Amino acid sequence: ASCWAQSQGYNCCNNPSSTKVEYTDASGQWGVQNGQWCGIDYSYGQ
């Protein structure tokens, strides 16, 4: 698995293990950065 937000078309938070989540939906949890939504995922490595 990986960036799950991708299924919808959102970006991905760099290093999600240290990105305070500001979002929270059926897509898991997300983080806000640069004023843009990114998908926070543990399998997000690439």
Could you tell me if 41 and 7 are in contact, meaning their C-beta atoms sit under 8 angstroms apart?
A: no
Task: Spell out the residues 6+ positions from residue 4 whose beta carbon is closer than 8 angstroms to its own.
Answer: 27, 28, 39, 41
CA 13 to CA 1: how far, in whole Å?
15
CATH of 1-46, one of 3.40.50.20, 3.40.630.30, 3.30.1490.100, 3.90.1220.10: 3.90.1220.10
Round to whole Å and give the CA distance between 45 and 25. Answer: 21
- Residues present in the chain in total: 46
DSSP collapsed to 3 states, 1-46: CCCCHHHCCCEECCCHHHCCEEEEECCEEEEEECCEEEEECCCCCC
C-alpha span between 45 and 16 (Å, rounded): 9
Question: Taking the domains of the chain in order of start, what are their residue ranges?
Answer: 1-46
